[PDB]
Amino acid sequence: SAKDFSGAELYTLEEVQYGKFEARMKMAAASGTVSSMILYQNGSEIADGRPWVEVDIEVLGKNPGSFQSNIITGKAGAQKTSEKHHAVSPAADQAFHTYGLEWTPNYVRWTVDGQEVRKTEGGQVSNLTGTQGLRFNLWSSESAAWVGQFDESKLPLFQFINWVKVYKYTPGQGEGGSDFTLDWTDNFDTFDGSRWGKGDWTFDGNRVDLTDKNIYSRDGMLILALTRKGQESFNGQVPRD
Ligand SMILES: [Ca+2]
Ligand SMILES: [Ca+2]
Ligand SMILES: [Ca+2]
């Protein structure tokens, strides 16, 4: 649209209340970029007084060896946040890792390759009311302090998603008596339009227009691309997981 760069956002058409969410991915990273997996209550961004409900995993480009976790509550223009950082090894853009988010009435948990890196309870959790959809996005932030100055010479960049698993919150009824039960898996052999949407919008602080042109399906993976406007393409080699 009106911006000079093109990014991408894969989002579930449906939203859910609570659950466990896993995504097998190799993230993108260069100074200035944001490569993510998030839970998001659609409409949170509307400043009409309604609450903001969001849980994040965001690889900040200048620091590929870690990701920032966050929970955003409060409301548009007055967000309450809780940014923390977690080391990832090998670096997020150097290997596939399984990223997990668990959201229940009592806590939000973040896992990497099955290991807990963060568990939050309390106020913000009590305010993650309603439903959230699962999304993945690749963009560039104008806050250099947050992600580093944007190095356009590193473009194009790609985030690869091998598969996604979504589990329903079934307290005390999952396997081994756990609290989750697998609901569905998407192996990304194709782009399933009955399950996912491709974003076509932008927001303040984002120097890219999220576009459906930058979501590709190849060799069993879903690819999100960050490119200069007018150079939207993927010709490279899809990595092996
Ligand atoms: Ca620059
Ligand atoms: Ca796959
Ligand atoms: Ca769209």
Curated annotation (Swiss-Prot):
EC class (word): hydrolase
Domain GH16: 3-172
GO biological process: carbohydrate metabolic process
Enzyme Commission number, as recorded: 3.2.1.73
Keyword annotations from UniProtKB, A to Z: Glycosidase, Hydrolase, Repeat, Signal
Keyword presence, Ribosomal protein: no
Location of the active site: 54, 58
Catalyzed reaction equations: Hydrolysis of (1->4)-beta-D-glucosidic linkages in beta-D-glucans containing (1->3)- and (1->4)-bonds
GO molecular function: licheninase activity
Similarity comment: Belongs to the glycosyl hydrolase 16 family.
Designated name of the protein: Beta-glucanase
